[PDB]
Design a protein around this ligand. Structure first.
Ligand SMILES: Cc1ncc(C[n+]2csc(CCOP(=O)(O)OP(=O)(O)O)c2C)c(N)n1
Ligand SMILES: Cc1ncc(C[n+]2csc(CCOP(=O)(O)OP(=O)(O)O)c2C)c(N)n1
Ligand SMILES: [Mg+2]
Ligand SMILES: [Mg+2]
Lengths: 801, 801
């Protein structure tokens, strides 16, 4: 930790290249429009919300960047990737409006998007696909997302895929936000990877929402200490130009002592007093310091500002940041929250108008008018000139990539569609599918396999010799090894999954990890990924409650699909066979990176259990994609039922079908459900449409088109709701669901499948139970089956176990 | 960073108090039993799994702690809270066995616990309620959990609730694990809070699972750098005693230079070589370093050891941490991953026994026999004597608290059961309920309100003056303000929610935050909380997709209940009225902290929208707890339907009921469903039981004891699945569910409820459609309704919008 003063002394401060007076005129108009937008919204009295205080404290920081640093998307690259702090969006909108990129009607529709011509509260690409790029409002995700975005850009350059050398990633953060574990939890990574293309800009106004970050301390010093300790280049922008003479004249060095010893709480109090209170309680602490401003008027003392408000001090920091190599830079900008709002936190409106000399007359002020700069005016000319010299305007977004990829055909995965000689798993199938992709000339180098330390567990080792591990193991390595860091891996996956838009360079990531540590552990990022229109694959390996049998409670995943189904644009599958994996992966590739360019990403749970992999039935392709297809029909004269299974449990439902036929003469239709969720969604869509078109013939859910009315039983390696979600659409009077509800525990797969009541014996008992209630068989038959199969009818419900 | 040598010089380390030779014998026996336990498991060939290399590298560290530091639960306090590293559990089981706390049958049942007498793969209290205490296998959670556990102990002392001054929180971490953002993301909090009762013990074997943490770097230096920068006291245990002489004689300082410059990857290569190799490649780097061991034999050089394997160096480090005040201490213990096993890292284990001089011939090794010390032996006596001096054995756990609390009665919440004077929200109802509890003499001071910065947003600011904010706003403050850190707040919540077990001091936490940032953002901790038997309340504020209307995409929660239902012991409610909030909170209090002491925690979504709060219907209490009750029946001669709603949408479902009656003559039964999830679980439990007892009287789902067979419509502020989950149990042929599927966006509540097709008009159209289907009304009536209500039947599905 250094002294509580600017890192860059004035004698090392470069000359400011812009027109300070003109830029201030433009900046005031932006401040005004940002405030007008939020105020007009509040007048509606519709609890729309919107902030003003934050942007007022960081406006000048962004202004200097827009005028002298921010590089817009261009022919060579996607320009600088700016992770704008979420709630300062009104300021971004105000500037875009001034630049003529947004209309007054859009500003007037701030926070009213449903009808189409509005603006999102925060940066949401999904809602404004041509404007916003990075979802930052969920605090903490922006800083780590930015770290890996910068790492990914280095990756593209090192891989020889794209020269991203002129791109800088800017993460605009709040000091309170730095408390989120993900904000500083991965900063050492920037040092390990020498991310000199990453700049953290922490707005240090010393306050969070309901108070100071650390009133009894100094968060700027806390931030400096840990970032410095993490190997980052720390640049503190503490005081404005007005303090320079005072510091120079301070021979006793007592002023510096005073600045260092004062805590955030005290500074904040001076922040709400007056020049007299300052010279009295601040400078008046020591005669050396008190004498420094003795010949100063209370108004000249109150004029002393914080560095984050001085364009000159700001410029120096960003210039130094862009020159620095070998490590990432973090700029700690000292600002005043709610700057220039005085009474804040119609007289208030008049105050800001006067405060920033806004060109609005008393006659118009009541109209809460937006300010514009006429073409030909000095402001208009300068505003556009600076941007033009920096390649255009930002933020802006390209929804689709331009190049045409020559994707592998399903036939290219032919081997996976055939019966397998050796017993393998769906994870082995996944790896083989990847290998097929690594042979496709058009996308082989666009593939981005990602692992979180463990590769052997998922049989990814074979890939190492083929494409290697990115380790700028060398700079050309293709696989991203992020270590024990699922969130970090997810962020690399996200950067890769959205490269098609950000860099107009489609990259196809495949991140495989323990399924449990997916949505459950990085769920907020997965939701943000949907918002960011990510197109890639998330592979939940070692999935299924009973399948990762020895690991127990915190590893056995029987619910990730319940978490994944909450994301609108995530398509989830739980294949049982190798050929399904192939079909699903091929379809995903085509949908996301083929002509369609569908904005959706995939989640495929794979297994670590080997078993016989049969050949794909002819014509089953569509059913596999849709989510269900009839595997086969087993004859039986004493009864008829339908059996459904997915994942590792399907082969057990198949065993039950054979038992039912052989021991009870009960026939059955056996279905492989590759996706209960896609089926549920299709069903909901049909019912929704039917409800809205009462005069039309009811549409039929696909699952209802595949199934019949015979009593049905479904068993999965997931909690019952996973299969129960399609109940409404199953055309059968009876539909019993077996599932793995309850906490996992360590044991053999056989013991766990009996414990969770999902194995063959339970499926059989469930099936016989339905046939009994229909009179087709006597109840003693099921009671005898229960005894026969060593089933404990009175063991505690697994959910409670 | 400091030089790559021990922090504590030899002339500064205290005399080792233990019997080195005796301790090694005991340690070797533990090492043996641990290996045997895992080997016998693998023999079964049931893919049970289990690790050995990790415990081998940290075995000595734990041994010194068990012999001289770890305080077991005692009459005065819960003892030291040790977050044992998850996968080294075999070593803990081995010691427990040697202490006579576990039987041979239990060790032989390692990772096979379904039938009872077995052992969990890792620390899982839910599975082993009297043994394990803190779930640490999901890496990254243990370090944050520990930080907040330490802070909570400070809190209990400062609040005058319990003298926890004699307790120390030890977090045993892996170095690879430190890459998880959660691992270092909150370490500055330990400094802010001067957590000198917290000790992080990082096993620095330099390797994660598939490779080194940072092969071309120095992970220990990285760790020292950021922790030191965060204000922690860092103690490096680098080299064993054999190095002291070498370091002392080297007047050139070259050995230190050599140690500093050598990277992790090279040190690891040495480990796989021999004395000659080290002599040449390490000491041979410089003539001065070569000269230090010139008179040494290669064997002597090979004997040079890493500090983390030397009891004297380890002891010195833990003793110094014990003396350090003002902040937390991190011990960086340098170890060898595949320590003993070496070449390994059934008979090949003789190499293990040879190097650790294990008493067992190569004739009985194939038998993989366990080693035990008979009562009276020098080892047995020493083993127990050291533990007795430290108050007993650990880990151990107390499932229930001993004191009886005098909980408030429901009548104490009487004011909340009456009609409210003004329109309020369920969040205001929640705060008023908390106030009732704060008046109860028995639990007032055991309550732990927790917020993450935002308090005013949840109307919590009023409590700030009554009970204050914990700030050691003073050391007596009752409210925990954890800032913008949901994971941290969750960890404080967890520490409080499990104090009843850990300190035999029940504390009742109420953590309120933006519902979206609950399970979605800290879901892995919520799962771990269930495993830890947490008993507390999670309050998801500003919940419901359409209710937090202006916030948009990353704030509008219409799915947290879908995530919460995946946790077996989490009880979730989505109340619409203030009286329901009261009944639910009182019941939760009674269930968790009353005589029942049920191991479950509560999740209650509350709202930021005010509306009329009617009085509770007489006798509706149990129905509220169970999940559903009939509000009223409206007469109608043209038809009859059932209408269900929860949360903020219920009042709109009631509006629909009035419309149907007044405009279409359609009568209805209106139900408030306080918990679709509890109703779903009840139904699942009933059918499970029924199918398991085919000859007995079938149990009827609770929801089927409330609803009838008339066509039904349900609508909530959550995705359709939230209400569709009870389909199988709804005793009606038609059950249409409306929901908020799709990403949120900014607008008025009215526009969002129409966009998400959940408002009164959609409920009406849904109900009429059902009637039209059964010919009770003309299809034209439904079509006409759609037109009248300005419903766009061809609007894109909200899920895809
Ligand atoms: C994960 C998450 N939690 C909580 C919030 C709610 N929130 C909005 S503004 C705010 C405080 C902002 O403080 P800081 O990060 O210091 O930024 P400032 O506005 O002062 O620039 C909070 C907690 C959020 N957006 N995301
Ligand atoms: C969140 C999470 N991700 C992955 C794993 C799988 N895992 C088990 S052991 C291991 C490596 C452990 O390395 P380290 O933390 O360095 O400890 P060591 O075993 O070397 O002492 C991993 C990644 C886990 N337990 N938790
Ligand atoms: Mg701030
Ligand atoms: Mg390690």
């Amino acid at each position: 930790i250094s002294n509580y003063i600017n890192t860059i002394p004035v004698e090392e401060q470069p000359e400011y290249p812009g027109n300070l007076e003109l830029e201030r005129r433009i900046r005031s108009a932006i401040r005004w429009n940002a405030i007008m937008t939020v105020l007009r919204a509040s007048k509606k009295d519709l609890e729309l919300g919107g902030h003003m205080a934050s942007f007022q404290s960081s406006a000048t920081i962004y202004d200097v960047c827009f005028n002298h640093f921010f590089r817009a998307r261009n022919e060579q690259d996607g320009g600088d990737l700016v992770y704008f702090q979420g709630h300062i969006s009104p300021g971004v909108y105000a500037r875009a409006f001034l630049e003529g990129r947004l209309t007054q009607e859009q500003l007037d529709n701030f926070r009213q998007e449903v009808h189409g011509n509005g603006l999102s509260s925060y940066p949401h690409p999904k809602l404004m696909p041509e404007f916003w790029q990075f979802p930052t409002v969920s605090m903490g995700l922006g800083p780590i997302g930015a770290i890996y975005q910068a790492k990914f850009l280095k990756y593209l350059e090192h891989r020889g895929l794209k020269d991203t050398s002129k791109q800088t990633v800017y993460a605009f953060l709040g000091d309170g936000e730095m408390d989120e574990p993900e904000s500083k939890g991965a900063i050492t990574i920037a040092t390990r990877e020498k991310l000199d293309n990453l700049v953290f800009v922490i707005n240090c106004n010393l306050q969070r929402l309901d108070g100071p970050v650390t009133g009894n301390g100094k968060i700027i010093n806390e931030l400096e200490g840990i970032f410095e300790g993490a190997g980052w280049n720390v640049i503190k922008v503490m005081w404005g130009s007005r303090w320079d003479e005072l510091l120079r004249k301070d021979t006793s060095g007592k002023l510096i002592q005073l600045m260092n010893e004062t805590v955030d709480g005290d500074y904040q109090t001076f922040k709400s007093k007056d020049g007299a209170y300052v010279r009295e309680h601040f400078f008046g602490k020591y005669p050396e310091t008190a004498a420094l401003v003795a010949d100063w008027t209370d108004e000249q003392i109150w004029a002393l500002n914080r560095g984050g408000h001085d364009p000159k001090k700001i410029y120096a920091a960003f210039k130094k940041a862009q020159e620095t190599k070998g490590k990432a830079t973090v700029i700690l900008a000292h600002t005043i929250k709610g700057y220039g709002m005085g009474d804040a936190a119609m007289d208030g409106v008049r105050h800001i108008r006067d405060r920033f000399n806004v060109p609005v007359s008393d006659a118009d002020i009541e109209k809460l008018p937006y300010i514009t700069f006429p073409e030909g005016s000095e402001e208009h000319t300068y505003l556009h000139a600076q941007r033009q010299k920096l390649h255009g305007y930002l933020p802006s977004r390209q929804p689709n990539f331009t190049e045409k990829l020559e994707l592998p055909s399903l036939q290219d995965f032919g081997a996976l569609l055939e019966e397998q000689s050796k017993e393998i798993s769906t994870t082995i199938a996944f790896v083989r599918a990847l290998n097929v992709m690594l042979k496709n000339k058009s996308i082989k180098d666009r593939l981005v396999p990602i692992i979180a330390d463990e590769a052997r567990t998922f049989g990814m080792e074979g890939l190492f010799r083929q494409i290697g591990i990115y380790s700028p193991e060398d700079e050309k390595g293709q696989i991203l090894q992020e270590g024990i860091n699922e969130l970090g891996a997810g962020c690399s996956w996200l950067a890769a999954a959205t490269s098609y838009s950000t860099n107009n360079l489609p990259m196809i990531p495949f991140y495989i990890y323990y399924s449990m540590f997916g949505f459950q552990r990085i769920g907020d990022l997965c939701w943000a990924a949907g918002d960011q229109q990510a197109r890639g694959f998330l592979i939940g390996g070692t999935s299924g409650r009973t399948t990762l049998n020895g690991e127990g409670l915190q590893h056995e995943d029987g619910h990730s699909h319940i978490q994944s189904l909450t994301i609108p644009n995530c398509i989830s599958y739980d294949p049982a066979y190798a050929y399904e994996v192939a079909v699903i992966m091929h379809d995903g590739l085509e949908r996301m990176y083929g002509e369609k360019q569908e904005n959706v990403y995939y989640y495929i749970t794979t297994l670590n259990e080997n078993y016989h992999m049969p050949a794909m039935p002819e014509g089953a392709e569509e059913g596999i994609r849709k989510g269900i297809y009839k595997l086969e029909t087993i004859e039986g004269s004493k009864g008829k039922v339908q059996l459904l299974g997915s994942g590792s449990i399907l082969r057990h439902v198949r065993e039950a079908a054979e038992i039912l036929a052989k021991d009870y003469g009960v026939g059955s239709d056996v279905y492989s459900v590759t996706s209960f969720t896609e089926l549920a969604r299709d069903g909901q869509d049909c019912e929704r449409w039917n409800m809205l078109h009462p005069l039309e013939t009811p549409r039929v859910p696909y699952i209802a088109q595949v199934m019949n009315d015979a009593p049905a039983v479904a068993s999965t390696d997931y909690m019952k709701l996973f299969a129960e979600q399609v109940r409404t659409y199953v055309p059968a009077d009876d539909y019993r669901v077996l599932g793995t509800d309850g906490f996992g525990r360590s044991d053999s797969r056989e013991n766990l499948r009996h414990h969770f009541e999902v194995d063959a014996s339970y499926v059989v008992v469930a099936a016989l139970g339905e046939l009994a209630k229909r009179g087709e068989i006597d109840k003693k038959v099921v009671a005898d089956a229960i005894a026969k199969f060593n089933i404990d009818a009175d063991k505690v419900n697994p959910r409670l176990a």
